[PDB]
Amino acid sequence: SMNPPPPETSNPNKPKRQTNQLQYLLRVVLKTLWKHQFAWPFQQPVDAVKLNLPDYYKIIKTPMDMGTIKKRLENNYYWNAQECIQDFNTMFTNCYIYNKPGDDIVLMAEALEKLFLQKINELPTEE
Ligand SMILES: CNC(=O)c1ccc2c(c1)nc(-c1cc(C)c(O)c(C)c1)n2CC1CCN(C(C)=O)CC1
């Protein structure tokens, strides 16, 4: 009935690197989705307490959100671009698991995912 703690965003025990793919994921992919008119419900963990959704974290056991993804990129949580792409995919899949076809939040998720796929289909080459 409490919210879970948000996902880990900075792990000192993880090695860190800068790559053109990770720079692109923060500065092009995340930044573009972040500034979208429909971004705001995805910029932080679902607050199931304040929204009074007592079943949200009974159904969604792998929560993810763009606030968490942004901090993960900012703090080198991802070594491989695929780890970041997986987190975006998890965020969209959670929305489609919990919500119903035609729901306002689902139409918002679809618009962001369309933009996500447009941007990640132009990811730069791997070192
Ligand atoms: C100051 N406000 C807030 O902080 C606030 C308010 C409402 C929030 C909200 C945060 N987060 C969610 C949300 C997000 C996701 C990904 C979900 O899977 C679910 C079940 C809820 N909602 C409900 C949806 C907001 C957008 N919708 C519209 C504009 O119609 C649909 C409902």
UniProtKB/Swiss-Prot annotation:
Modification after translation (UniProt): Phosphorylation by CK2 disrupt the intramolecular binding between the bromo domain 2 and the NPS region and promotes binding between the NPS and the BID regions, leading to activate the protein and promote binding to acetylated histones. In absence of phosphorylation, BRD4 does not localize to p53/TP53 target gene promoters, phosphorylation promoting recruitment to p53/TP53 target promoters.
Site location (Acetylated histone binding): 99
Localisation per UniProt entry: Nucleus; Chromosome
All residue ranges annotated as the Bromo domain in the record: 17-123
Effect on the protein of changing residue 99 to A: Abolishes binding to acetylated histones
Tissue: Ubiquitously expressed.
Cross-link (Glycyl lysine isopeptide (Lys-Gly) (interchain with G-Cter in SUMO2)): 58
Domain comment as written in the entry: The NET domain mediates interaction with a number of chromatin proteins involved in transcription regulation (NSD3, JMJD6, CHD4, GLTSCR1 and ATAD5).
Note, other: JQ1, a thieno-triazolo-1,4-diazepine derivative, and I-BET, a benzodiazepine derivative, have been tested on tumors with success. Treatment with GSK1210151A (I-BET151, a I-BET derivative) has strong effets on mixed lineage leukemia and promotes myeloid differentiation and leukemia stem-cell depletion.
Record text on subunit structure and interactions: Interacts with p53/TP53; the interaction is direct. Interacts (via CTD region) with CDK9 and CCNT1, acting as an associated component of P-TEFb complex. Interacts with RELA (when acetylated at 'Lys-310'). Interacts (via NET domain) with NSD3, CHD4, BICRA and ATAD5. The interaction with BICRA bridges BRD4 to the GBAF complex. Interacts (via NET domain) with JMJD6 (via JmjC and N-terminal domains); the interaction is stronger in presence of ssRNA and recruits JMJD6 on distal enhancers. Interacts with NSD3. Interacts with NIPBL.
Family that this chain belongs to: Belongs to the BET family.
Disorder this protein is connected to according to its UniProt record: Cornelia de Lange syndrome 6: A form of Cornelia de Lange syndrome, a clinically heterogeneous developmental disorder associated with malformations affecting multiple systems. It is characterized by facial dysmorphisms, abnormal hands and feet, growth delay, cognitive retardation, hirsutism, gastroesophageal dysfunction and cardiac, ophthalmologic and genitourinary anomalies. CDLS6 inheritance is autosomal dominant. A chromosomal aberration involving BRD4 is found in a rare, aggressive, and lethal carcinoma arising in midline organs of young people. Translocation t(15;19)(q14;p13) with NUTM1 which produces a BRD4-NUTM1 fusion protein.
Function, in words: Chromatin reader protein that recognizes and binds acetylated histones and plays a key role in transmission of epigenetic memory across cell divisions and transcription regulation. Remains associated with acetylated chromatin throughout the entire cell cycle and provides epigenetic memory for postmitotic G1 gene transcription by preserving acetylated chromatin status and maintaining high-order chromatin structure. During interphase, plays a key role in regulating the transcription of signal-inducible genes by associating with the P-TEFb complex and recruiting it to promoters.
Protein name stated in the entry: Bromodomain-containing protein 4
